Write a protein that binds this ligand. Structure first.
Ligand SMILES: O=C1NC(c2cccc([N+](=O)[O-])c2)=CCN1c1ccccc1O
Ligand SMILES: [Ca+2]
Lengths: 153, 478, 233, 88, 51
């Protein structure tokens, strides 16, 4: 689990900072930095495909133009009031990130879980019945009545 | 042979002819008879008259007789002159073996094979036993080689160099039978080197670590540990002696039986070096320097520096990036210049093999993209060049961040799994091959059934490649 | 010259290991030729393998009449080319007359053996007395004279093997006729160069050998495992 | 479904093979990091460039007996190892 | 007879690989071969081995 979280955090930070830097310009709000760098590439692990990279399915009614209300900033515009970002640099970026995290990195965790279950099973019964000692010696040690009356004792 | 020896001995003229009896028992394989009634009486031994019979026992594959001759006494280095070596490598050297040596030097070239090609070019036109060992080991003699190997001084170096030569010669594709025997003899000598060094370590640690670092006065121009590395003999390094050597060399002055959290806790609080928390076994300023010299803590300081560099890069790129460089951008250029100094140091101290590793290639490429982003970035009052400079820095940040995976391969826990990660490329490529074939087939079929004569290339590649690609993550094309 | 087969090689390697484990002197000839070469080799090897814990003591006792290069000093010498052996840590060379005189050192050697055999050192398990063992393996007149001077003296503890030249002729029989029969059957190429006026003397030598059969022992052929030298000594 | 769950199976089989070799390959790779962090005389990192100027200072100006002793040591365990081989 | 163990042995596999590369020797690398494939008049150089 920790090896999975290490690799996923590295890919998540790299893609999040690259996408936030290519799209927008000089965000000054910390909450909308950490929603757009950490949170949305995190949701792309459950099959979300981060949205505002396409430049044809992007509307300007979810922006602020300056941070005044809740919504994110717009992508920084042109002198013709067009989005500046190349689709040919952000569509394959999302495709590589989405392949690398949603498919390769989860199905590697499946393989490592399967191998660990394959190792530890002939030892698992031994470790369980070794742990059995502690519960027997905590439920056979005290002179114990049933529970909600124990405080009287 | 016994009948001929009984006829030769009882002539009552040649009973003084021990040379004729010895040559007759050499032409046949009578070892036991020559041991029982030639070398028994201690009556007449000259110890230098045994030379032509030695040359014959070498060229006719008589390992038991040369064992008997060295058992009764002969000096190899006195015997083995340059004329003997030219007669061996010139006349008694095979011609199919030389063709396989040509093919191996042409297609599988290396440092040790360039060295042995130079010495075999020397002797077909000063460490003599090693050259005779190379002659016997190339020929796949397999039993004279052991007899000379028992007489050598640098035995572990000889076994590792022989294993390297034979693992290289076992890759030549014609005459696969000779490749098979050379492979088996390679495995035998690498087993021999491992089993000798584990004894040399299990008696004494200090003199075994003395053995590991010697170059034998240009044996092949390299070291025992270097020959184990260059042959990819990972079983020689996966043994506890070399691993104990490496761990003791890695912690530096700090003893190995201290816990790691004490070490990093003393790392963060710098004047804490003067306390009884760490053990320096393996006045006060010596504790200070013996802490701050070790590879462990200079590595850990270096990775703390690299994480702080990534945080500064991210701050500059996302929150403070204007038409003129402010103060943290200039601090960022300073830190990138420091990394560039380290990389040109490593290119200086390695040379041309520096470009062998892929990490150094993408490392130099990332520095190139950084200075290209600088030369796009300084053209102020031009918004397009400034935006293009920031996009260049973003892709360069991707590269710098993904270097951190290669950084953390040294760990006891994450390390083996990161090394395991590069064995998956053939499965990933098989997946991508089948998925690309299905994706192209469905995309062209759907675009052809639905629409009619699209003339825009972008809306061809959005509707053929991109939407069937998204249907891998559960989209169901609409 | 001497044949160094791996059985005698193993025996003398084990012997020098026992002498290192017990802290014993080893008395020998001390010349560069033959067996003393191998003894100096194994002394050098057991010295170079441990370099501490009672570095062993080998005394070569030579005649001074067979040494080729001799230096008269007070001033260390540099002896190079009988030749003396390189690795014996102590040497004693007896003074006598001219050059061609073998069997000179044997008198002082046997008298030194007798004196340490009568020397009392109570810090042991032998009731003092510093126990002394003689080894014979090969052949020659020096061997037989040394064995008889030992067995005439007290505490000889003579040990032989079951391979060699005279070790075979002593090992096989344990009167005059059987001595003749063994000496002609195990030494085929020595009897031709011998007058019988001293062959009868050798018969007297061996009859003085076999008087005390409790002071003599042998290493056999079936007994060929490990720690057979300790089981003999 | 089919093509992704086949990749899962091939990943699981490759992890099943390479694991007993993985520790060997990791501690073989350990040599290179130790020999790049033990070779140079290295101070901690952001000051290293100053030490680079020290090497510029260089461009501003510019048979053994214990070896035979330890090889002679090696020969003894070689002989012991040959004794062990023939003892087996 | 579907006796695949008789064909999975190195003799018949060596026969098949030597019959598959044709005139080109087997101990040349594949990238040289496809590089000489794309550049057609490159056949006259010392890059491939026809043993
Ligand atoms: O020395 C280093 N140089 C670079 C580097 C330097 C310049 C450019 C790039 N790059 O773009 O990938 C990388 C990578 C990280 N790194 C490092 C730091 C601490 C521990 C281990 C390490 O390898
Ligand atoms: Ca580098």
């Amino acid at each position: 689990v920790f090896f999975f979280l290490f690799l996923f955090a590295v890919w998540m930070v790299a893609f999040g900072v690259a996408r936030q830097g290519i799209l927008r310009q000089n965000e000054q709000r910390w909450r909308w930095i950490f929603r757009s760098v950490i949170y949305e590439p995190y949701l792309a692990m459950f099959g979300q495909v981060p949205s505002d990279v396409d430049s044809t399915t992007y509307d300007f009614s979810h922006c602020t133009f300056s941070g005044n209300e809740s919504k994110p900033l717009c992508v920084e515009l042109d002198e013709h009031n067009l989005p500046r970002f190349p689709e040919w640099i952000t569509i394959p970026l999302v495709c590589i990130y989405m392949l690398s995290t949603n498919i390769l990195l989860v199905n590697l965790l499946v393989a490592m879980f399967g191998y660990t279950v394959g190792i530890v099973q002939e030892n698992n019964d031994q470790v369980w019945k070794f742990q059995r000692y502690f519960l027997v010696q905590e439920y056979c040690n005290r002179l114990n009545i049933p529970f909600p009356f124990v405080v009287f004792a | 042979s016994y009948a001929l020896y009984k006829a030769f001995s009882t002539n009552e003229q040649d009973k003084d002819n021990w040379n004729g009896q010895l040559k007759l028992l050499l032409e046949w394989n009578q070892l036991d008879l020559a041991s029982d009634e030639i070398f028994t009486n201690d009556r007449r031994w000259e110890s230098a008259d045994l030379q032509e019979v030695m040359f014959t026992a070498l060229i006719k594959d008589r390992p038991k007789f040369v064992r008997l001759f060295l058992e009764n006494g002969l000096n190899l280095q006195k015997f083995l002159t340059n004329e003997v070596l030219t007669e061996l490598f010139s006349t008694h050297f095979s011609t199919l073996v030389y063709r396989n040596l040509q093919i191996a030097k042409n297609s599988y070239n290396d440092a040790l094979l360039t060295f042995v090609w130079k010495l075999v070019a020397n002797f077909r036109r000063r460490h003599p036993l090693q050259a005779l060992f190379i002659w016997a080991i190339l020929q796949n003699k397999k039993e004279l080689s052991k007899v000379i190997w028992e007489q050598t001084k640098g035995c572990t170096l000889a076994a590792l160099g022989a294993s390297k030569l034979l693992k290289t010669l076992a890759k030549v594709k014609n005459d696969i039978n000779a490749a098979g025997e050379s492979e088996e003899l390679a495995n035998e000598y690498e087993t021999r080197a491992v089993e000798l060094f584990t004894e040399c370590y299990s008696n004494d640690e200090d003199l075994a670590e003395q053995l590991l670092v010697y170059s034998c006065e240009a044996w092949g121009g390299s070291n025992c540990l270097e020959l184990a590395v260059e042959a990819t003999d990972q079983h020689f390094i996966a043994q506890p002696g070399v691993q104990n050597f490496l761990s003791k060399q890695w912690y530096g002055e700090i003893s190995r039986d201290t816990k790691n959290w004490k070490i990093i806790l003393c790392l963060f609080i710098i004047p804490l070096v003067g306390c009884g928390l760490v053990s320096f076994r393996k006045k006060l300023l010596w504790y200070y320097v013996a802490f701050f010299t070790s590879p462990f803590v200079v590595f850990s300081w270096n990775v703390v520096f690299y994480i702080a560099f990534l945080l500064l890069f991210a701050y500059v790129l996302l929150m403070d990036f204007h038409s003129v460089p402010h103060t943290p951008e200039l601090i960022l250029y300073a830190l990138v210049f420091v990394l560039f100094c380290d990389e040109v140091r490593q290119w200086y101290m390695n040379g041309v093999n520096y470009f062998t590793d892929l990490w150094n290639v993408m490392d130099t490429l990332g520095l190139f993209y950084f200075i290209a982003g600088i030369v796009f970035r300084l053209h102020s009052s031009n918004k397009s060049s400034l935006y293009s400079g920031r996009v260049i820095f973003c892709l360069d940040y991707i590269i710098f961040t993904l270097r951190l995976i290669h950084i953390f391969t040294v760990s006891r826990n994450l390390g083996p799994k990161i090394i395991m990660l590069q064995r998956m490329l053939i499965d990933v490529f098989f997946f991508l091959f089948l998925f690309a074939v299905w994706m192209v087939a469905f995309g062209v079929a759907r675009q052809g059934i639905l629409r009619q004569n699209e003339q825009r290339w972008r809306w061809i590649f959005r509707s053929v490649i991109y939407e069937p690609y998204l249907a891998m993550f559960g989209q169901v094309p609409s | 010259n001497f044949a160094l087969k791996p059985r005698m090689r193993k025996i003398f390697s084990r012997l020098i290991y026992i002498a290192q484990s017990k802290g014993a002197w080893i008395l020998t000839g001390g010349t560069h030729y033959g067996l003393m070469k191998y003894i100096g080799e194994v002394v050098r090897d057991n010295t170079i393998s441990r370099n501490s814990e009672e570095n062993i003591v080998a005394i070569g006792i030579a005649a001074w009449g067979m040494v080729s290069n001799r230096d008269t000093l007070i001033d260390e010498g540099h002896f190079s080319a009988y030749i003396l052996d390189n690795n014996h840590t102590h040497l004693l060379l007896v003074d006598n007359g001219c050059h061609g005189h073998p069997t000179v050192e044997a008198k002082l050697r046997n008298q030194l053996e007798k004196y340490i055999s009568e020397r009392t050192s109570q810090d042991s398990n032998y009731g003092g007395k510093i126990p002394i063992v003689c080894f014979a393996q090969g052949g020659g007149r020096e061997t037989l004279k040394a064995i008889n001077t030992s067995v005439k003296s007290k505490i000889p503890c003579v040990v032989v093997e079951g391979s060699g030249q005279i070790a075979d002729v002593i090992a096989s029989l344990v009167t005059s006729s059987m001595v003749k029969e063994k000496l002609v059957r195990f030494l085929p190429r020595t009897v031709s160069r011998l007058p019988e006026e001293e062959i009868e003397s050798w018969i007297k030598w061996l009859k003085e050998i076999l008087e005390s059969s409790h002071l003599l022992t042998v290493i056999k052929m079936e007994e060929a495992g490990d720690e057979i030298v300790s089981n003999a000594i | 479904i089919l093509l992704v769950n086949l990749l899962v199976a091939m990943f699981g089989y490759t992890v099943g093979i390479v694991q007993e070799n993985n520790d060997q390959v990791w501690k073989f790779q350990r040599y290179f990091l130790v020999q790049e962090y033990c070779n140079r005389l290295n101070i901690p990192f952001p000051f290293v460039v100053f030490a680079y100027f020290y090497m510029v200072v260089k461009k501003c100006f510019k048979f053994r007996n214990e070896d035979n002793e330890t090889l002679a040591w090696e020969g003894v365990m070689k002989e012991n190892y040959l004794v062990k081989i023939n003892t087996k």
